[PDB]
Curated annotation (Swiss-Prot):
Its EC number is 3.4.23.22. Belongs to the peptidase A1 family. Keywords: Aspartyl protease, Disulfide bond, Hydrolase, Protease, Signal, Zymogen. Residues 17-328 form the Peptidase A1 domain. The keyword Signal applies. Disulfide bonds join 255-290. The lineage of its organism: Eukaryota, Fungi, Dikarya, Ascomycota, Pezizomycotina. One of its GO terms (molecular function) is aspartic-type endopeptidase activity. One of its GO terms (biological process) is proteolysis. The active site is at residues 35, 199. It catalyses: Hydrolysis of proteins with specificity similar to that of pepsin A, prefers hydrophobic residues at P1 and P1', but does not cleave 14-Ala-|-Leu-15 in the B chain of insulin or Z-Glu-Tyr. Clots milk. This is Endothiapepsin. It comes from Cryphonectria parasitica. Coiled coil: none annotated. The chain holds residues 90 to 419 of 419 of the full protein.
């Protein structure tokens, strides 16, 4: 089997992407944030504290003839930005782009943090990291991909995120029309539960490539590119007036600037992130100070190849017995 679904930016900055997901019988379609940096599929629901729901579409398990309470199971998750959610668990039928999994754990939120409430466009998360990170207790549950993979034509999914435009998540096949040149595959460590790999270096604009190993994660659920402070300083030094602002929480730059590209290495291959991809717009409405899309990972403890990087590539998440990652230009 295969599946193919369009993923759409939630706003004009590509702050996140949402993908429609069918849950239950009859189908209830929710728009979920596909997140290769976590492993829980959770949704706003009829169980979510009423004051914490503000415009989201909810899953109502009592209206699904295939929903079953997973007795005694609870979940609770925190993300790197300090947001969180928790609740109980159902199993139900979940379909993405025509690919169906029966008995998928659907984690129903009883509580969500304010940031979720305040974002009407995201109805929940669909985790695509390794199932070892799943938070369900006392019986850990499998991701949608983990459940689907034996049925897939090939045990892979691909992320093809758009810049200020829709893109595609495919399951079970590689669309050879969706990229240019060849896909370069690179080793993955699953030891921390992530799609963790080592980039071979970087360049800033038309500058020379610096060969250096940068261990980090491919994370569709993180907006920005978080890299070591040395690398980030070298990038922003090429933008007149750019500076790190403790009050804003990262590098800012004059909105009048033209940003240089940023290249990252995948083996001997190179992925080029155009300068425009690194502009996250005014820090507050009407400001002439703009927020940068490349930020330091120093306070995080891990480097993160988030959407800013991934959207510049066609990315293969290869879930073979020994997982690997592939990157192609597009
Ligand atoms: C997974 C989940 C989260 C939760 N926080 C979050 C999720 C989506 C967002 C977001 C914030 O802020 C910008 C809009 O999209 C953050 C990172 N990885
Ligand atoms: C990543 C979320 N996007 C974004 C855009 C502009 C910002 C921002 C964050 O945080 C600091 C102020 O300016």
């Amino acid at each position: 089997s295969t599946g193919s679904a369009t993923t759409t930016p939630i706003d004009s900055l590509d702050d996140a992407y949402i993908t429609p997901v069918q849950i239950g019988t009859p189908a209830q379609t929710l728009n979920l944030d596909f997140d290769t940096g976590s492993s829980d599929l959770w949704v706003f629901s009829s169980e979510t504290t009423a004051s914490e729901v503000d415009g989201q579409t909810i899953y109502t398990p009592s209206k699904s003839t295939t929903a079953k309470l997973l007795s005694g199971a609870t979940w609770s998750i925190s993300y790197g930005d300090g947001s969180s959610s928790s609740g109980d668990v159902y199993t139900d039928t979940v379909s993405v782009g025509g690919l169906t999994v029966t008995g998928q754990a659907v984690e129903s939120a009883k509580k969500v943090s304010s940031s979720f409430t305040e974002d009407s466009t995201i109805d929940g998360l669909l985790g695509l990291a390794f199932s070892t990170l799943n938070t369900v207790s006392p019986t850990q549950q499998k991701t949608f991909f983990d459940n689907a993979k034996a049925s897939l034509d090939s045990p892979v999914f691909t992320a093809d995120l758009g810049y200020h435009a829709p893109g595609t998540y495919n399951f079970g096949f590689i669309d050879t029309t969706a990229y240019t040149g060849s896909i370069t595959y690179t080793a993955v460590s699953t030891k921390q539960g992530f799609w963790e790999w080592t980039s071979t270096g970087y360049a800033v604009g038309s500058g020379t490539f610096k060969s250096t190993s940068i261990d980090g994660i491919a994370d569709t659920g993180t907006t920005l590119l978080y890299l070591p402070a040395t690398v980030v300083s070298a990038y922003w030094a090429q933008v007149s007036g750019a500076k790190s602002s403790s009050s804003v929480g990262g590098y800012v730059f004059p909105c009048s600037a033209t940003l240089p590209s940023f290249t990252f290495g995948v083996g001997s291959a190179r992925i080029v992130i155009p300068g425009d991809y690194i502009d996250f717009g005014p820090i507050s409405t009407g400001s002439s100070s703009c927020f940068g899309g490349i930020q330091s990972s120093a306070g995080i403890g891990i480097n993160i190849f988030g959407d800013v990087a991934l959207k510049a590539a066609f990315v293969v998440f290869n879930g073979a017995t020994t997982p690997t990652l592939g990157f192609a230009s597009k």
